[PDB]
Amino acid sequence: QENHHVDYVIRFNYGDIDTPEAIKKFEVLLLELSEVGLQTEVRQGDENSLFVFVRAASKKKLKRAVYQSRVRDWLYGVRNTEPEQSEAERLLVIYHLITVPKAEGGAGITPRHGEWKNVDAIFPLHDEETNRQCMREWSKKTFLSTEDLDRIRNTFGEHVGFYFAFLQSYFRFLMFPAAFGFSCWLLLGSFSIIYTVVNCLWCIVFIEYWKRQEEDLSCRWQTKGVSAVHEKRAEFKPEKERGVFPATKRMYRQLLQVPFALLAAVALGAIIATCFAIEIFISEVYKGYLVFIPTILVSALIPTMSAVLLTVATKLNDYENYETQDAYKVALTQKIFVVNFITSYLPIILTAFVYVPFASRIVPYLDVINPDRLRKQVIYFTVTAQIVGFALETDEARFLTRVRNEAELEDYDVTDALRAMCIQFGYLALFSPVWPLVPVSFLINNWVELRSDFFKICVECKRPWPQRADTIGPWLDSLGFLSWVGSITSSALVYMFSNTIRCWALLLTIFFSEHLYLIVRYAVRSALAKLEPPNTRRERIERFMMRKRYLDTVLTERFWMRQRGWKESAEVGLSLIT
Amino acid sequence: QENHHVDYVIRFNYGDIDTPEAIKKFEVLLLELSEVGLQTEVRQGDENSLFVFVRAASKKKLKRAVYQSRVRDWLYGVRNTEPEQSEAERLLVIYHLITVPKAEGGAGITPRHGEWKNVDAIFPLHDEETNRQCMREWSKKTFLSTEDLDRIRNTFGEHVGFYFAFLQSYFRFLMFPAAFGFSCWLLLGSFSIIYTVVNCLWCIVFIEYWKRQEEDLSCRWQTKGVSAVHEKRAEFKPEKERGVFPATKRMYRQLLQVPFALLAAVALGAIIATCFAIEIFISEVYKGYLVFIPTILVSALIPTMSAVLLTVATKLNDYENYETQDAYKVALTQKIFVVNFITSYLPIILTAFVYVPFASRIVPYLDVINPDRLRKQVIYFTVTAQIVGFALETDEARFLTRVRNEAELEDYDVTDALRAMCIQFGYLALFSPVWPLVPVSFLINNWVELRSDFFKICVECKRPWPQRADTIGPWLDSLGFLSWVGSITSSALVYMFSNTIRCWALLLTIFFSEHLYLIVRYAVRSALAKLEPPNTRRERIERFMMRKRYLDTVLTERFWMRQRGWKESAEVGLSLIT
């Protein structure tokens, strides 16, 4: 093939070790790779690092690897076939040959955690025929079929497959608010009740539909349940019998998220109040569109402030010392959600429920505010970042240098572009009745950046190892929390700013709209549970027939003496009736 | 033994058939019982009914029955051992031999549904040594050990076992509000905030603790997952390939619950308004405790009005034509919960939020109201029914007539005494801060009636066939809904009736108390998920070791030629570092 049958390539760096110490850690790595059935070949890489090439050493060793991985998947509950395939399947079982805890599988490699500090990251090689002769059919397509998502599952794994399927379903479901809000901008305007009810209905229906499509796609890609949690770079304090860490010592570090979030909220509310003060000063001392210059500056500085808070949250999450990857991911997603909620929505919350209604009590406290100010805030905080972001755009030595060019690329992260599609959903759920062209501005940006994720995953960063998944992650609970908060927030905004405040009716239409949201969400979930998707119905039919075939295969004392057999019992019965 | 090795006894009635028609249905029953390995013996019963006696016909047929039932339990997901025991286990596999759908198991008997109209109910025989030499150790005990619940699991099955464990845990958890409300009656009085917060905390903790004890007990009794749904007496319209019934035709009958519930609510609010009118008339035309006579009469007529609405709800649920038993049970529990919510709490809701605050606008509309009226209503609707209920109390022809006396008894129902323990929890969650002696009045009645369920299940009605369960049913969701409604209702009552109404603060302390309830419930659930019960930790340890033992048991082309083996690769590595 194009790649020289290479499954993986393992980069071992020696720029931080001695001359005689690196020759022992290299021999230990080669002996651990040769203890399992992996054939190794060493070549020179960069000026301080050499990489080895890992292949299946034989057909018998590869068959034993696939059988051991299928045994682990059947024992953990992923497989239900009691075992006795593709490119992603072979790459997954070879990555499980390299990187497991050595009690099963083998080779014990953890890339830069402990006792393997010299080796750098390991990675497979890019399928050139799949990211050249198929990447330029996916960018100029605008919509992907299920057989097209099968090609992004068979390469790059089910993790990338679920991420791209979620982006496709979100772009397909975004076409309804992008048409409806534009239809409710030429006809109804800002703060309309019809658009708010239909927008909250859409926010319910999209989440309850993707929750069904996830169970559809995890039964289609034969990955219906993944609870096989993996280890990490945990620093265990004791070693009592397995490394242990007390949860009471973890909660005392988990409580540090509260002062961090509170200080970030105060430090951003100070910037928002400063922007209000400079806007009032410019409105006093002169001016049409130039009076909202610091709001535009802080709305453009949002994505570089959230990154700083993201690095602080990553350091705080690494301090909390999690054991499993499926807990570190959940805690990181919770911290990213808190940071993005503080960063992206609280500038609009502080001008929707604090600044504009209590204008006469804070404007004299700032000088040393009609609802169009809130409309301009929702305009400036969902558009200008995307405007600025789209303004910065304006014999075998060939294979070895291709691999050396592939080792200098970045590493892909789903959790960076999936964070933005949560901020968009939070702007859609919470403050979208303020300006109904928020879905149009999101759909245009998504249609522009649709051909930017294929390019990124194909030519900009290296190929990820094929990771299995049954869901997009804990972002699907963040979407539900955003819809729940938006059902209160949009109803309060529509009451406060359509057409005194009558404070009993505001807290009545908060209560009734929240509980109507809960009732309608239960109804939509129970209605979508009834209708079964096809590729999880085929799996249920197959698992029913596989059980029915097996079941059809497998198929004092003188009182019980007066009626031998059953014909005598029938004779006693016929004598006893008459 | 005492019983003549009798597993089951099947009563066949002939009081409604002809003389020659009953001799064929009897022969069909005996042939269907003899097709499976069951030895039958016929004797005369009552003047229009004769019963047969069903035993395991051989050891090989009994072993085949246990193996087929274990195969069905392993295929449906109950068993995880891949098969190659007690009294309840033998009675369960013999009942599964008699009553299944004949595609598996055999004998096809459905007791009075279709093509078996002549046979009456079937039932096992009472273990006299277990309900005589052990029932008079359980009534005068007041508390049951786990080895004592094992005796009510090994007889009467896991359904009765979970019901008695729920009653024991509820009686043990009721001792804390029965002490705390009595401590908050000598010190604080009615409508106190401390008792309301602690009562809502107790309502959270009891439900989130029984949800953990259910997963404890279902892993202890080897019944951790039961999703093996059974058929029923469904009348299928078409027969397209299995009898089918469209859900769109079922929803049009399910919508009849709304006019039934609305008409019951209006018909009870009319009686409550009539009782208010007669109370105001007696208060005008004369009288200390006699002025609340119709309230006492309607509070005593509550349990005989809820029974009439229960029969209407049972007819409506049988009209809705459910296919599975695990859906008929859920819909019946929902209808019973709606009926009991209308019957037991809406008389207190109509005098807490309608009559007492708007007294000056309805008292002139009734004549042709201090919060002590609400306190007297909560007194009269949680006590006087229990007062009236506890005021109405003030050679082988011996075995055959014992069986004939056992066939005239009633049939046990868990869902009749488990309904009252939901009405008690609803009175505890919703209106208990009005009068803090509600938990004392419930604990005294529960301690009185604790020795009345053992008597009922042992000597008053016949022995149920051992039914398996993993939960008490869909009552555990009704308890959570009652706690959710009570977190709003008790906070509104404490704001309205402690020490103008200031209608913004009422709908503020509704909102904050409901969302504080949700936050604290999530915290209590996440804290109780951390702490693992012992008998589900032993099962997890066993399922981990059973997998670890099996896993330890089971364990272009010229580029891959320059380094044979791995020692040559280490030589190339040591040459390439230096």
Numbering used by the authors:
A (entry chain A), B (entry chain B): 11 to 94, 102 to 258, 268 to 312, 317 to 398, 421 to 446, 489 to 593, 604 to 659, 702 to 724
Task: Provide the authors' own sentences about this structure as they appear in the paper.
Scrambling by D511A/E514A afTMEM16 is modulated by membrane thickness like the WT protein in 0 Ca2+,  and in C14 membranes its activity is ~30% of that of the WT protein in C18 lipids and saturating Ca2+. To test whether the D511A/E514A afTMEM16 adopts an open-pathway conformation in conditions of high activity, we determined its structure in C14 nanodiscs with 0.5 mM Ca2+ to 3.1 Å resolution. As expected, despite the presence of 0.5 mM Ca2+, the protein adopts the same conformation as in the WT apo structure and there is no density in the Ca2+ binding site. In all reconstructions the permeation pathway is closed, with Cα r.m.s.d. ~1.1 Å to C18/0 Ca2+ and ~0.4 Å to C14/0 Ca2+, indicating that increased scrambling is again not accompanied by higher open probability of the groove. Together, our results suggest that scrambling of afTMEM16 in 0 Ca2+ occurs outside of a closed groove. In the three datasets for apo afTMEM16 (C18/0 Ca2+, C14/0 Ca2+ and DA/EA in 0.5 mM Ca2+) we could resolve 4–9 lipids per monomer, all localized near the dimer interface in positions closely resembling those seen in C18/Ca2+ structure, supporting the notion that these lipids interact strongly with the protein. No lipids could be resolved near the closed pathway in these structures.
TMEM16 scramblases dissipate the plasma membrane lipid asymmetry to activate multiple eukaryotic cellular pathways. The TMEM16 superfamily is comprised of Cl- channels and dual function scramblases/non-selective ion channels. Our results show afTMEM16 thins the membrane to enable scrambling and that an open hydrophilic pathway is not a structural requirement to allow rapid transbilayer movement of lipids. Scrambling by the TMEM16’s is modulated by two signals, binding of Ca2+ facilitates opening of the groove while the properties of the membrane determine whether the scramblase can thin the membrane enough to enable lipid flipping.
